[PDB]
Every structure is written in C-alpha cells, then in structure tokens.
Ligand binder design. Structure first.
Ligand SMILES: Nc1ncnc2c1ncn2[C@@H]1O[C@H](COP(=O)(O)OP(=O)(O)OP(=O)(O)O)[C@@H](O)[C@H]1O
Ligand SMILES: Nc1ncnc2c1ncn2[C@@H]1O[C@H](COP(=O)(O)OP(=O)(O)O)[C@@H](O)[C@H]1O
Lengths: 125, 505, 217
C-alpha cells in the first residue's frame, strides 16, 4: 500500500511537470511576439522562475523513479509500474528537448532579422 | 647539495651543476684541450617567495666568486635620454678591467637582475634602446668569458625572443612549491639554532607540523618559527628552562595566513545569517554539491568541471555556493565578487581577473567561485550596454584546461538566465542547479520557529490569517528574514508582518 | 588533407594554399586539423589560438599576429593553423559588435604570397559559417572541407568498444533501448566522451548512460 502511494506521487508530479513545460512554451511564444514595449519586454523574463522548477522536478523524478525501480526487482507488477513511469518521464524529457530546440531555432531567425539591414546613425566613441 | 641550507630542491641542483659548473671545475689544461667556452647566463623562474634569491646567492659562495652585484628591474629607468641605459652599461666595467689586466686567470664575477620582464619586452621609446644595449654587450665583438649573469622572473613568456638563444641565456629552470618532503626538510634546516643549543622541548614532532601545513610557500615557515619562539619567550616573562613547546607552534600556525591557501574569512562572512533547512530541497542541493566534489577529486580525465547555479533574485543563491565550498577541505579557495573590483579602471579589472586565474594552475587542487555575472559584465538593459572585453575574458577562461595534472572546479551564479541565452554564452556550462523560492505556509512555519519570532499564539494566528488570506504565497527568503526582523523590532505582529507579507508577495 | 600536403610540397607555381574546416560546434574540428598537420614532416609548424591571446590589449594582438606571420617567411616549408576564427575577432551577436582591425589584418594576410618561392600552407577553423558568409570574407579561401556529426547507433557502439566501456550484454541492452528510445540521433563526439566517462563512474549499468544519451540529443 506504500508502493502504490509512491506511484501515485510519481503520477501527480509528472502531471505538474508536463504542465510547467506547456506554460514555458507559452512564455517562449509571447516573448517572440513582442519586441517593442519596454517594461513588458522585461516582464516576460519571469520565464526564469518557470525554468527553475522544471529542473527541480526533473531531479526529483530522477531520484524517486530510481528508488521505485530498485524496489520493484522482485515483483513483476511493481516493475511494470516502474517501467511505465520511465516511459512517461522519457516522453516528458522528449517534449522538453523539442520545446528548447524549436525556441533556439526561432531566436536565431529574429536575430538575423534585426541586423540584416541598414542601421541607426553611428555611435558616440 | 643539502649540506647547505636549501631543502626540497634536488633535481634542480643536479641539472644546474651538470650544465653550468662541469666546465669550470676541472684544471684549465683539460678543458682548454677540450676547447669549449663557458655558459654565460642563466634564467630560473617561478612564483614569488620560493627561495630564488637564496639559491642565486649561494651559488656564488660555492665557486668562491667575488661578492655579488645586485640590481632590481624598475629602478634601471631614468627620465633623461640614454642614462636609463648607461646604468646597464656600468655593471660590466670591472669585469672588463680585470679580464684585460690578468687574462684567463681572473676570478669569476656575478651579477643579479631582478624582475627581468619589467623592462625587457619583445621589441618591434626607451624600451628598444634598453633591450638593444643589453644585446650588444651580453655577447659582443670582444670576448669576455669570466662573467656569469643570473635571471629571476615569474612570466617567461614575455621576454624578447633573442635573449633566449644559445649564447646569452642557455639554462632555463623552474622552481615549484615545496612538497611534503620539502616542508619537513625546511623545518629541519630552519630549526638548527634551537636544536643544538637546546631550547626546543622533546614533545614537538615536526613531522606532524609538516603534514599539517599544506601549500606553505617556504619563506613563511620561518615566520611561523620565529613567531612561535617569540610567543614562548614573551609568555615566559624566569630562566629555568626556556623551552618552546607545541602550544606555541599551534598558536602561530593558527594565526598565520598563507598566500596560496583558503581565504576563510570572506566565506564565513558570506554565510553570516546561518543555514537552517526550512524545507526538503536544501538537503538535496547539498548532496548534489558533495557528489560533484567527489567526481572532481577521484577521476583522472575530467580535470575540470564547470557548474552553474541559478534562480530568481533574492532566492539566496550565493550562500549555497559558499556552504558547499566550506565543507570540502580543499587547500586552495578564493572568491571573486564585484565588491573587490569596485572603483578600479577597466584595464585593472581585466588584469585582476587574469592574475586570479593564473595563480590556481600552480596548486594541486583548487575550487574557485564567481559571485555574479551580469554585475561584472556591466549590464544595463536600456540600449542595452555592457563591456565586451571582460565578457570575452570570462568566455575564454571557462574552457582552459589546467596545464598539467593540477585540477580545478569552477562555481558560478546568476539570476538572469534569459539574458545569458540571448548572449549565446550558455555553452560554457555542463550542469545546472536551480533554486526556487518558497511557495508554502509550513515553510514559513519552519523558518519562524527557527528564528523564534514569537510565542506559539502569535505564530498560529499569523499562519491561520495567511492561510485564509494569501492562497498562492510566493516570495524569496531575503524578504522573509528581513520582514520577520522588522516585525519583531516593531509593535503588534499582525499590524505589520501580515500586511507587509501580503504586500510583498 | 594528405593529397593537399603532397600537392603543396611539390609544385613550382602553387606557393600559397588556404583551406577551411567548418562544422557544428563539438564536431571536433581542431583534432583533425592537428592530425593532418603532424603527419607531413614540414619543418616549421606553429599555432595561433585564443589560448595564447589572453588578456592583452588590442595593439598587442595585432603585433603578435604580425610577428607570427613574419617569422614564417624565413623558412623553406611552413604550415600554420588558426583556431576559431570568429573568436579571435570578438564576435557577439547583439548589435552585433566585433573588432574590425583584426578582421582586416587577417583578410589581408591570408592572400600574401611568400617571397622567393618559399612554401606555406594555412588551415583555419570555425563553427559559425553563416556569419562568415555575412561579413563577406569567404572569398579568400580556395576550398572547404565539411565535418558533420555522428548519426547512427552502430557508430556509438564503435565508440563504446574503443572506450572498452561496454560489456557484452550491456551493449545489446543499451543499443536496443536507445534504438526504440530515440528515432533521430545526432551529437558531437566531445559530449559523447564526456558522457561515457561520467557514466563509467556511478551506476555503471545501462540506465544512467541511456538517459544521458537522450539527455545529449
Ligand atoms: N537556506 C537559506 N535560504 C535563504 N537564505 C539563506 C539561507 N541560509 C542563509 N541564508 C541567508 O541568505 C543570505 C545570503 O544569500 P545572498 O545574499 O547571496 O542571496 P542572493 O539572492 O544571492 O542575493 P541577491 O538578491 O543580491 O542576488 C544571508 O543572509 C544568509 O544567511
Ligand atoms: N627553499 C627554501 N629553503 C630555505 N629558506 C627559504 C626557502 N625559500 C625561501 N626561503 C627563505 O626566504 C628568504 C629568501 O627569500 P626568497 O624566497 O629567495 O625571495 P623571492 O623568492 O621572493 O625572490 C630567506 O629567509 C630564505 O631562508
């Protein structure tokens, strides 16, 4: 009965971790949109306080999934539960990677956009 | 070799003796029959305060040379035209005179330059004239083979290319820090007046003392011993038996601060507020740090690791770095923060940083921490503006593997993740730790019991009020601690603490 | 590379040749460049890298570079290697800012014929091909090698066996697991080596490495 409680804990945490990835995705897209207005431009940098928790949940799921798979060595059902958690966590990792890559590819294009043109009049010295 | 007062330097004397004196010891009949000239220059290099002056001095006495003539680098310069170099010329006069007069039976002369790179940079101003003057004379049209010149420096990679040719500065030698055997021998040599004259107790075991002192430079051991003896005698004032016991040694050892050792004081200051585990994360973070420390110490191929910790502002990030450092026991520890660098000029900052990098490569084992990045880089978002050069210094630094088997761990912290990716610097770092701030009420409970804010009634009521009021509590620890103190030293905890705490989240 | 070496050693007219090795970061360009250089026997070989150009001032940068070219003319056969052009010059994207004079110096230098029929070869490396196109410097070079990443599991197994990290069941387990865990696979060798070594110490079995290999891609 302890083990099933642990697996429920894993399930609930994986659900939040998915949620945070999706929130982060939105934070990306609106940071791409709005380049102009000063203070709100700074405001989307709260994405930091979305990234930190993603890392922490990653480290947690790391440790508890390792403990669970160790615990399930002698029971096939426990092992099945552990493997399901592994599969789902791997999928999450894949989602995170995809989001990161897409955002990197998009940040390059905006960078190319801005300076591939004649520029504001020359600096001071 | 070791009959004379120099401990730990063994290979160096075999090499130097073999190359330098093996052609001045035999009768001139033989070596003349051999037809070989004499080495006429020497460059030994190393960190300061390692005993270079001493070795240079003792060499002359071994050969029964004339008394050494001494000069130091920057003093050569004068501010009139061509006298800055006249001084360089003056030094060889007596050797010339005695050579012309006597001939081949003259007695050897010795000259010592100090801080050679201070003037003699690569050529191509006064500087070219100085370098020229030394070249034309060190080996000129007229033969002069009864002289020897010794060179002392810290940076070999800046001297002009021509002085290092076979004929001017033949033998290049390196002086490194003493090993354990070096420290033991150093103690043995230094404590000779005490030993024979019988004013050291029999309880002190200098081998233990040697083991206890790591990265001590070899000069400061003298400081230790003289301080300990002075301590003992001052404690006495009786002439029964003036004995120096281990307590003096322990006291003096505790007092002194080596140059290449732990800088404890600033780290203790960094963590002045204490480390209380108000939640579960703290344990995990510290475990991570310990893990990485082990990985550095035990491996062979991973001679360097870069580790980043980041999180929201005020999350208390730097303290964790200091804590991880202090619970490790490595010999070399230093801290770079904006605090030191404030007020300096740009060139000064780059110099400071780069010095602070190079020193570490010497020691076997090192950890090095950086306090904040956007601050050092001079970021300000409107425009934006920042200094490119310092950025490049750091960028280059964070890839340099230690030149030899020495080992290094680099720790750094920031709050502006987003900027760093937009900078395209993020590739420096292998692994990351995150530090989010508190979003719970029980955590408030843990901290306030640890701070002992008030009696249980106030505590319970405030947690109840914030439970019923603030549902999505979210702030860092800084404001929590300062707000708690403000409420304590103010009146009526509900009147402020609750209100402030809502106003802050 | 060997062909180019032979070509430069024996040809009356071809006194000067310039190559470009480019590829994604971590694909491991410098290693190849050094390997080409070593197996030629050319008597004068010397290297420029940001490693040496650390913490001096700009005038010093130019002076040092100039000297390093000048001395090369004074020998019959020579090879020079240049590391991370786009980094000697101080490229940083926002603005974008970078130093001009060094770029110009290199632009001029890479075209100069050595005097009296002496022989020179130049290799240079970069990881930012696009910006090189943008700055309009790409004219100077006669040819271009390309280095891609590793992209198949069998290659990874080759790497494991060269490291002698694998066991016999271990390779099967890891290879199959990653075969179904990752459809597309592309990473730099540098990271691969780092990963294998960090995996060799703690939790040697397949798991740590598997999720780490994912954690690379
Ligand atoms: N576990 C802890 N959580 C939070 N603060 C702590 C903790 N332990 C100690 N502190 C306190 O945090 C302070 C040191 O952290 P520090 O001032 O570097 O925070 P920071 O967020 O890095 O600062 P800044 O907001 O300027 O970036 C000290 O008052 C220290 O006692
Ligand atoms: N290896 C050593 N053995 C004995 N004494 C040393 C050694 N190194 C330094 N010292 C002591 O330090 C002083 C010599 O200074 P030194 O270290 O030669 O100056 P620097 O290294 O700054 O040129 C002397 O008192 C000398 O006895």
């Amino acid at each position: 009965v302890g083990f099933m409680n642990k697996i429920s804990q894993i399930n609930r945490d994986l659900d939040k971790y998915d949620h945070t990835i999706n929130q982060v995705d939105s934070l990306h897209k609106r940071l791409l949109t709005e380049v102009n207005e000063e203070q709100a431009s700074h405001l989307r940098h709260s994405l930091d306080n979305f990234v930190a928790q993603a890392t922490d949940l990653q480290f947690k799921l790391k440790n508890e999934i390792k403990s669970a798979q160790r615990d399930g060595i002698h029971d096939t059902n426990k092992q099945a539960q552990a493997e399901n958690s592994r599969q789902r966590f791997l999928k999450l990792i894949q989602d995170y990677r995809i989001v990161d890559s897409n955002y990197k590819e998009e940040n390059k294009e905006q960078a190319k956009r801005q300076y591939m043109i004649i520029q504001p009049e020359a600096t001071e010295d | 070799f070791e009959d004379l007062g120099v401990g730990g330097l063994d290979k160096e004397f075999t090499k130097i003796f073999r190359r330098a004196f093996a052609s001045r010891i035999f009768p001139p009949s033989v070596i003349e029959k051999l037809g070989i000239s004499h080495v006429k220059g020497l460059l030994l290099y190393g960190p300061p305060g390692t005993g270079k002056t001493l070795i240079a001095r003792k060499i002359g006495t071994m050969l029964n040379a004339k008394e050494p003539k001494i000069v130091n680098g920057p003093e050569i310069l004068s501010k009139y035209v061509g006298s800055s170099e006249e001084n360089i010329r003056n030094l060889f006069k007596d050797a010339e005179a005695e050579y012309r007069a006597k001939g081949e039976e003259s007695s050897l002369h010795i000259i010592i330059f100090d801080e050679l790179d201070s003037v003699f940079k690569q050529r191509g101003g006064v500087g070219d004239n100085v370098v020229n003057q030394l070249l034309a004379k060190m080996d000129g049209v007229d033969q002069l083979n009864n002289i020897l010149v010794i060179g002392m420096t810290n940076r070999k990679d800046l001297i002009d290319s021509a002085l290092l040719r076979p004929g001017r500065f033949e033998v290049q030698v390196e002086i490194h820090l003493p090993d354990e055997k070096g420290r033991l021998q150093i103690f043995d040599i230094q404590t000779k007046k005490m030993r024979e004259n019988n004013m050291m107790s029999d309880d002190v075991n200098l081998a233990e003392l040697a083991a206890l002192t790591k990265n001590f430079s070899g000069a400061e051991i003298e400081g230790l011993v003289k301080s300990a003896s002075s301590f003992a005698i001052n404690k006495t004032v009786d002439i029964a038996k003036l004995k120096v016991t281990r307590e003096d040694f322990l006291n003096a050892l505790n007092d002194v601060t080596p140059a290449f050792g732990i800088s404890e004081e600033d780290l203790k200051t960094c963590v002045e507020g204490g480390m209380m585990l108000y939640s579960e994360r703290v344990n995990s973070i510290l475990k991570n740090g310990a893990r990485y420390v082990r990985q550095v110490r035990e491996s062979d191929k991973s001679r360097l690791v870069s580790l980043l910790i980041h999180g929201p502002a005020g999350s208390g990030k730097t303290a964790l770095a200091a804590e991880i450092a202090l619970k490790s026991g490595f010999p070399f520890i230093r801290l770079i923060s904006p605090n030191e660098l404030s007020g300096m000029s740009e060139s000064a900052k780059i110099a400071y940083i780069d010095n602070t990098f190079r020193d570490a490569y010497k020691s076997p084992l090192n950890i090095l921490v950086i306090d904040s990045l956007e601050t050092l880089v001079d970021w300000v978002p409107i425009g934006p503006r920042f200094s490119n050069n310092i950025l490049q210094m750091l960028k280059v630094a964070l890839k340099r593997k230690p030149p030899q088997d020495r080992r290094l761990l680099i720790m750094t912290t920031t709050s502006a993740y987003s900027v760093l990716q937009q900078m395209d610097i993020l590739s420096c770092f292998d692994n990351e730790i995150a530090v989010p701030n508190m979003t719970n009420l029980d955590e408030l409970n843990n901290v306030m019991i640890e701070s002992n804010f008030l009696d249980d009634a106030g505590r319970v009521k405030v947690i109840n009020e914030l439970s019923r009021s603030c549902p999505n509590f979210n702030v860092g620890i800084k404001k929590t601690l300062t707000n708690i103190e403000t409420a304590r030293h103010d009146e009526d905890p509900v009147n402020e603490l609750v209100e402030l705490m809502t106003q802050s989240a």
